[PDB]
Short mmCIF file of C-alpha atoms and ligand atoms in Angstrom, two decimals:
data_model
loop_
_atom_site.label_atom_id
_atom_site.label_comp_id
_atom_site.label_asym_id
_atom_site.label_seq_id
_atom_site.Cartn_x
_atom_site.Cartn_y
_atom_site.Cartn_z
CA UNK A 1 -10.68 3.69 2.99
CA UNK A 2 -13.34 4.21 5.64
CA UNK A 3 -13.51 7.55 7.46
CA UNK A 4 -10.60 9.05 5.51
CA UNK A 5 -10.39 12.19 3.37
CA UNK A 6 -9.67 13.07 -0.23
CA UNK A 7 -5.95 13.02 -0.92
CA UNK A 8 -4.28 16.25 -2.02
CA UNK A 9 -2.77 16.28 -5.54
CA UNK A 10 0.71 14.62 -5.53
CA UNK A 11 0.31 13.68 -1.86
CA UNK A 12 1.02 9.99 -2.52
CA UNK A 13 3.04 9.92 -5.79
CA UNK A 14 4.13 6.30 -5.18
CA UNK A 15 0.49 5.13 -5.12
CA UNK A 16 -0.21 2.53 -7.78
CA UNK A 17 -3.54 1.12 -8.98
CA UNK A 18 -3.64 -2.53 -10.02
CA UNK A 19 -6.19 -2.62 -12.83
CA UNK A 20 -7.90 -5.67 -14.29
CA UNK A 21 -8.08 -5.55 -18.11
CA UNK A 22 -11.36 -7.47 -18.51
CA UNK A 23 -13.64 -6.85 -16.81
CA UNK A 24 -12.16 -3.34 -16.38
CA UNK A 25 -12.00 -2.98 -12.60
CA UNK A 26 -9.89 -1.98 -9.61
CA UNK A 27 -7.99 -5.00 -8.38
CA UNK A 28 -5.84 -3.60 -5.60
CA UNK A 29 -3.50 -0.82 -4.55
CA UNK A 30 0.27 -1.11 -4.82
CA UNK A 31 3.32 1.17 -4.57
CA UNK A 32 6.18 2.35 -6.74
CA UNK A 33 9.59 1.49 -5.27
CA UNK A 34 11.83 2.30 -8.29
CA UNK A 35 11.35 3.06 -11.98
CA UNK A 36 10.71 -0.62 -12.76
CA UNK A 37 9.46 -2.27 -9.56
CA UNK A 38 6.09 -2.19 -7.89
CA UNK A 39 5.21 -3.68 -4.50
CA UNK A 40 1.87 -5.12 -3.47
CA UNK A 41 0.15 -7.79 -1.32
CA UNK A 42 0.51 -11.38 -2.49
CA UNK A 43 -3.25 -11.90 -1.97
CA UNK A 44 -3.95 -9.34 -4.69
CA UNK A 45 -2.40 -11.77 -7.19
CA UNK A 46 -2.90 -15.22 -5.67
CA UNK A 47 -5.75 -16.30 -3.40
CA UNK A 48 -7.15 -19.80 -4.16
CA UNK A 49 -10.08 -19.60 -1.72
CA UNK A 50 -11.50 -16.92 -4.04
CA UNK A 51 -10.23 -18.44 -7.30
CA UNK A 52 -7.75 -15.61 -7.73
CA UNK A 53 -4.57 -16.42 -9.66
CA UNK A 54 -3.61 -13.55 -11.96
CA UNK A 55 -0.86 -13.75 -14.57
CA UNK A 56 1.15 -10.81 -15.94
CA UNK A 57 -1.11 -10.41 -18.97
CA UNK A 58 -4.31 -10.14 -16.92
CA UNK A 59 -3.28 -6.83 -15.31
CA UNK A 60 -2.07 -3.30 -15.87
CA UNK A 61 -0.48 -0.90 -13.39
CA UNK A 62 -1.67 2.75 -13.42
CA UNK A 63 0.69 5.20 -11.77
CA UNK A 64 0.24 8.91 -10.97
CA UNK A 65 -3.51 8.65 -10.46
CA UNK A 66 -5.94 10.66 -8.38
CA UNK A 67 -9.38 10.03 -9.84
CA UNK A 68 -10.51 6.40 -9.32
CA UNK A 69 -12.33 5.93 -12.63
CA UNK A 70 -11.13 8.69 -14.97
CA UNK A 71 -8.44 8.17 -17.54
CA UNK A 72 -6.07 10.97 -16.38
CA UNK A 73 -4.64 12.00 -19.71
CA UNK A 74 -1.14 13.57 -19.52
CA UNK A 75 -0.90 12.66 -15.81
CA UNK A 76 -1.18 8.92 -15.22
CA UNK A 77 1.09 6.38 -16.85
CA UNK A 78 -0.11 2.87 -17.61
CA UNK A 79 2.50 0.13 -17.48
CA UNK A 80 2.52 -3.54 -18.48
CA UNK A 81 3.88 -6.33 -16.33
CA UNK A 82 7.03 -8.20 -17.30
CA UNK A 83 7.00 -10.60 -14.34
CA UNK A 84 5.26 -11.21 -11.01
CA UNK A 85 7.14 -12.50 -7.96
CA UNK A 86 5.15 -13.83 -5.01
CA UNK A 87 6.96 -14.59 -1.72
CA UNK A 88 7.59 -18.38 -1.87
CA UNK A 89 6.42 -18.78 1.75
CA UNK A 90 3.27 -16.68 1.37
CA UNK A 91 0.67 -18.42 3.56
CA UNK A 92 -2.68 -18.06 1.81
CA UNK A 93 -4.05 -21.20 3.50
CA UNK A 94 -4.03 -19.85 7.03
CA UNK A 95 -3.26 -16.26 7.98
CA UNK A 96 -1.74 -14.34 5.01
CA UNK A 97 1.72 -14.56 6.56
CA UNK A 98 4.31 -12.99 4.23
CA UNK A 99 1.57 -11.29 2.21
CA UNK A 100 4.00 -9.66 -0.27
CA UNK A 101 4.61 -9.63 -4.04
CA UNK A 102 6.80 -7.71 -6.47
CA UNK A 103 5.93 -6.82 -10.05
CA UNK A 104 8.59 -5.91 -12.62
CA UNK A 105 7.43 -3.46 -15.28
CA UNK A 106 8.14 -3.97 -18.99
CA UNK A 107 9.62 -0.44 -19.33
CA UNK A 108 10.76 2.11 -16.73
CA UNK A 109 8.15 4.66 -15.76
CA UNK A 110 9.22 8.29 -16.03
CA UNK A 111 9.02 10.23 -12.76
CA UNK A 112 6.96 13.39 -12.65
CA UNK A 113 5.21 15.66 -10.16
CA UNK A 114 2.64 12.86 -9.72
CA UNK A 115 4.89 9.79 -10.00
CA UNK A 116 7.77 9.20 -7.62
CA UNK A 117 9.05 6.22 -5.60
CA UNK A 118 8.68 5.74 -1.85
CA UNK A 119 11.67 4.60 0.29
CA UNK A 120 11.93 1.16 1.85
CA UNK A 121 12.99 1.05 5.53
CA UNK A 122 16.30 -0.25 6.82
CA UNK A 123 16.70 -1.82 10.28
CA UNK A 124 17.24 1.54 12.01
CA UNK A 125 14.25 3.12 10.26
CA UNK A 126 12.05 0.23 11.36
CA UNK A 127 13.27 0.30 14.98
CA UNK A 128 12.73 4.02 15.43
CA UNK A 129 9.32 4.35 13.73
CA UNK A 130 7.51 1.04 14.28
CA UNK A 131 6.34 1.91 17.80
CA UNK A 132 2.90 1.72 19.40
CA UNK A 133 1.16 5.09 19.12
CA UNK A 134 3.28 6.30 16.17
CA UNK A 135 1.04 7.11 13.23
CA UNK A 136 1.34 6.13 9.61
CA UNK A 137 -0.72 6.87 6.56
CA UNK A 138 -2.76 4.50 4.41
CA UNK A 139 -4.12 5.38 0.97
CA UNK A 140 -6.34 3.74 -1.61
CA UNK A 141 -9.40 3.71 -3.85
CA UNK A 142 -11.23 0.99 -1.88
CA UNK A 143 -14.71 1.06 -0.36
CA UNK A 144 -15.76 3.98 1.81
CA UNK A 145 -17.87 1.59 3.94
CA UNK A 146 -17.93 -2.08 4.89
CA UNK A 147 -21.46 -2.76 3.56
CA UNK A 148 -19.76 3.22 -1.66
CA UNK A 149 -16.82 4.06 -3.95
CA UNK A 150 -14.68 7.23 -3.75
CA UNK A 151 -14.31 9.64 -6.69
CA UNK A 152 -10.69 10.30 -5.75
CA UNK A 153 -7.78 8.70 -3.85
CA UNK A 154 -8.51 8.50 -0.13
CA UNK A 155 -6.16 8.99 2.83
CA UNK A 156 -6.19 8.21 6.53
CA UNK A 157 -3.63 8.46 9.33
CA UNK A 158 -3.71 5.59 11.89
CA UNK A 159 -1.62 4.76 14.98
CA UNK A 160 0.37 1.55 15.24
CA UNK A 161 -1.16 -0.70 17.92
CA UNK A 162 0.57 -2.58 20.81
CA UNK A 163 1.10 -6.23 19.82
CA UNK A 164 -0.93 -7.72 22.75
CA UNK A 165 -3.88 -5.52 21.76
CA UNK A 166 -3.64 -6.67 18.10
CA UNK A 167 -3.56 -10.33 19.23
CA UNK A 168 -6.52 -9.91 21.62
CA UNK A 169 -8.70 -8.32 18.93
CA UNK A 170 -8.64 -11.33 16.64
CA UNK A 171 -8.91 -15.09 16.27
CA UNK A 172 -6.35 -15.09 13.42
CA UNK A 173 -2.83 -16.26 14.35
CA UNK A 174 -0.62 -13.11 14.20
CA UNK A 175 3.06 -13.39 13.12
CA UNK A 176 6.17 -11.23 13.39
CA UNK A 177 5.68 -10.40 9.66
CA UNK A 178 2.55 -8.42 10.54
CA UNK A 179 1.64 -5.37 12.56
CA UNK A 180 -1.74 -3.75 13.24
CA UNK A 181 -2.94 -0.16 13.22
CA UNK A 182 -6.10 1.74 14.03
CA UNK A 183 -7.80 3.63 16.80
CA UNK A 184 -9.29 1.99 19.89
CA UNK A 185 -12.98 2.43 20.82
CA UNK A 186 -12.07 4.83 23.67
CA UNK A 187 -9.94 7.03 21.35
CA UNK A 188 -12.97 8.44 19.48
CA UNK A 189 -11.20 8.87 16.13
CA UNK A 190 -11.89 6.30 13.39
CA UNK A 191 -10.56 4.93 10.10
CA UNK A 192 -9.47 1.75 8.34
CA UNK A 193 -8.58 0.29 4.98
CA UNK A 194 -11.40 -1.62 3.23
CA UNK A 195 -12.09 -3.84 0.14
CA UNK A 196 -9.89 -2.66 -2.75
CA UNK A 197 -7.25 -0.97 -0.54
CA UNK A 198 -5.35 -4.24 -0.27
CA UNK A 199 -1.78 -4.10 -1.48
CA UNK A 200 -1.59 -0.33 -0.81
CA UNK A 201 1.15 1.31 1.27
CA UNK A 202 1.22 2.16 4.98
CA UNK A 203 3.79 5.02 5.05
CA UNK A 204 5.58 7.09 7.70
CA UNK A 205 7.61 10.27 7.33
CA UNK A 206 10.95 9.97 9.09
CA UNK A 207 11.49 12.99 11.37
CA UNK A 208 15.26 12.31 11.00
CA UNK A 209 15.61 12.71 7.22
CA UNK A 210 12.11 13.92 6.29
CA UNK A 211 11.61 11.13 3.71
CA UNK A 212 8.56 8.87 3.38
CA UNK A 213 9.10 5.17 4.07
CA UNK A 214 6.76 2.31 3.30
CA UNK A 215 6.53 0.42 6.55
CA UNK A 216 3.47 -1.71 5.75
CA UNK A 217 1.28 -3.20 3.03
CA UNK A 218 -2.50 -3.31 3.48
CA UNK A 219 -3.05 -7.03 4.16
CA UNK A 220 -6.17 -8.03 6.13
CA UNK A 221 -8.92 -7.03 8.55
CA UNK A 222 -12.22 -8.20 9.90
CA UNK A 223 -14.84 -5.91 8.46
CA UNK A 224 -13.83 -2.29 8.02
CA UNK A 225 -13.58 0.30 10.78
CA UNK A 226 -15.31 -2.00 13.29
CA UNK A 227 -14.96 -1.03 16.95
CA UNK A 228 -12.48 -3.33 18.68
CA UNK A 229 -10.94 -4.57 15.41
CA UNK A 230 -7.77 -3.35 13.70
CA UNK A 231 -6.30 -3.39 10.23
CA UNK A 232 -3.31 -5.66 9.68
CA UNK A 233 -0.30 -4.86 7.56
CA UNK A 234 2.58 -6.74 6.03
CA UNK A 235 5.77 -5.76 7.88
CA UNK A 236 7.90 -4.51 5.00
CA UNK A 237 11.21 -4.39 6.84
CA UNK A 238 10.85 -8.01 8.03
CA UNK A 239 10.65 -9.11 4.37
CA UNK A 240 13.28 -6.76 2.91
CA UNK A 241 15.80 -9.61 2.51
CA UNK A 242 13.42 -11.34 0.08
CA UNK A 243 12.71 -8.00 -1.67
CA UNK A 244 16.41 -7.32 -2.14
CA UNK A 245 17.11 -10.87 -3.28
CA UNK A 246 14.46 -10.62 -6.01
CA UNK A 247 15.58 -7.21 -7.19
CA UNK A 248 19.27 -8.24 -7.05
CA UNK A 249 18.60 -11.37 -9.12
CA UNK A 250 16.11 -10.03 -11.63
CA UNK A 251 16.88 -6.32 -11.92
CA UNK B 1 18.58 8.51 -4.41
CA UNK B 2 15.55 10.80 -4.15
CA UNK B 3 13.08 8.21 -2.84
CA UNK B 4 10.40 9.41 -0.45
CA UNK B 5 10.68 13.10 -1.35
CA UNK B 6 7.55 14.34 -3.10
CA UNK B 7 7.92 16.83 -5.97
CA UNK B 8 4.85 18.79 -4.81
CA UNK B 9 5.69 18.78 -1.11
CA UNK B 10 9.17 18.04 0.26
CA UNK B 11 10.94 19.22 -2.88
CA UNK B 12 9.15 22.61 -2.62
CA UNK B 13 9.14 22.74 1.20
CA UNK B 14 5.32 22.58 1.25
CA UNK B 15 3.57 20.52 3.87
CA UNK B 16 0.43 18.51 3.27
CA UNK B 17 -2.64 19.11 5.49
CA UNK B 18 -2.12 16.20 7.88
CA UNK B 19 1.57 15.23 7.94
CA UNK B 20 2.01 17.28 11.13
CA UNK B 21 -0.31 14.78 12.93
CA UNK B 22 2.21 12.07 12.03
CA UNK B 23 5.15 14.14 13.31
CA UNK B 24 3.31 14.94 16.57
CA UNK B 25 2.87 11.19 17.19
CA UNK B 26 6.63 10.54 16.89
CA UNK B 27 7.21 11.34 20.56
CA UNK C 1 -17.82 2.89 -14.12
CA UNK C 2 -14.26 3.08 -15.48
CA UNK C 3 -13.49 5.33 -18.41
CA UNK C 4 -11.96 3.43 -21.33
CA UNK C 5 -8.18 3.61 -21.62
CA UNK C 6 -6.23 4.06 -24.89
CA UNK C 7 -5.93 0.99 -27.13
CA UNK C 8 -2.12 1.27 -27.05
CA UNK C 9 -2.36 -0.29 -23.57
C1 LIG D 301 -8.40 -4.26 3.49
C2 LIG D 301 -7.82 -5.67 3.68
C3 LIG D 301 -8.45 -6.61 2.67
N1 LIG D 301 -7.90 -7.95 2.86
C4 LIG D 301 -8.68 -9.06 2.82
O1 LIG D 301 -9.89 -8.98 2.62
C5 LIG D 301 -8.05 -10.41 3.05
C6 LIG D 301 -7.94 -11.23 1.73
C7 LIG D 301 -8.16 -12.69 2.23
C8 LIG D 301 -9.24 -12.47 3.31
N2 LIG D 301 -8.92 -11.18 3.96
C9 LIG D 301 -9.37 -10.75 5.16
O2 LIG D 301 -9.06 -9.66 5.61
C10 LIG D 301 -10.25 -11.64 6.00
N3 LIG D 301 -11.47 -10.88 6.33
C11 LIG D 301 -9.49 -12.13 7.25
C12 LIG D 301 -10.40 -12.68 8.33
C13 LIG D 301 -11.42 -13.59 8.04
C14 LIG D 301 -12.24 -14.08 9.06
C15 LIG D 301 -12.04 -13.67 10.37
C16 LIG D 301 -11.01 -12.77 10.67
C17 LIG D 301 -10.20 -12.28 9.64
C18 LIG D 301 -8.40 -13.15 6.94
C19 LIG D 301 -7.12 -13.00 7.47
C20 LIG D 301 -6.13 -13.93 7.18
C21 LIG D 301 -6.39 -15.03 6.36
C22 LIG D 301 -7.67 -15.19 5.84
C23 LIG D 301 -8.66 -14.26 6.13
NA1 LIG D 302 -11.43 -0.53 14.47
#
């Protein structure tokens, strides 16, 4: 996260770290959606241009974390993957369309003060909140700058951007399964996701029921916090049918 | 269920330092 | 710079 701030303790209890076993390193962010299911970006698990194709056994999920590097004894829980599910129409060749993946955990994780699932939006939630100018929140342990690493989880609040503005900022073909967020040059305020924040949640707090919903998944950008560029997010509600199908079949 | 309600915030009626900025944007 | 995690994992 570029131009964010240190998270408060328990501020993002659904935040998940995807951790590579060997070499031991941060792979991506992710989110907890129930006691056995974790959501992330497909490109965290499968991206042939970079020779990325992880299997279950290559990764661990670490839940309830704050410190990036510390083993948070008595606070974090480390879980093993039972199965990975990548959207079958994930477009890694072109534009990261449908950049979404689910991971089923071997055992349920116990909820705590630091570990708790985020809600997924329904149609009404999406319609009311996914509006230009409405702000959401993005969190992760990714780079602090484009071209280093935070000691603790970082947070930044960013406004959703009008679709014509998103399209005009980029040469990538934008789809309905994506939205963009970030401040414009004239707005003065800054912030963006960066390398290692991928797969992390973009969340909004409903003013109707005061619950946090995951509206987006950190998907792609062009640099980090560059003037005139925006961060792009997987549109969670647009893919909820696939999410539900997977959970209904395999849960 | 209890999704989206944080033990250290919503469940205790404590607000985090910047959630108000989100609310103020929901115009 | 990651601290080692328990062997159980
Ligand atoms: C914090 C987000 C991190 N996520 C990532 O790093 C992703 C992983 C794959 C590359 N990627 C990018 O964000 C590129 N940087 C992006 C791009 C490349 C060139 C010019 C404009 C956009 C891209 C967009 C769509 C398809 C391919 C590549
Ligand atoms: Na920008």
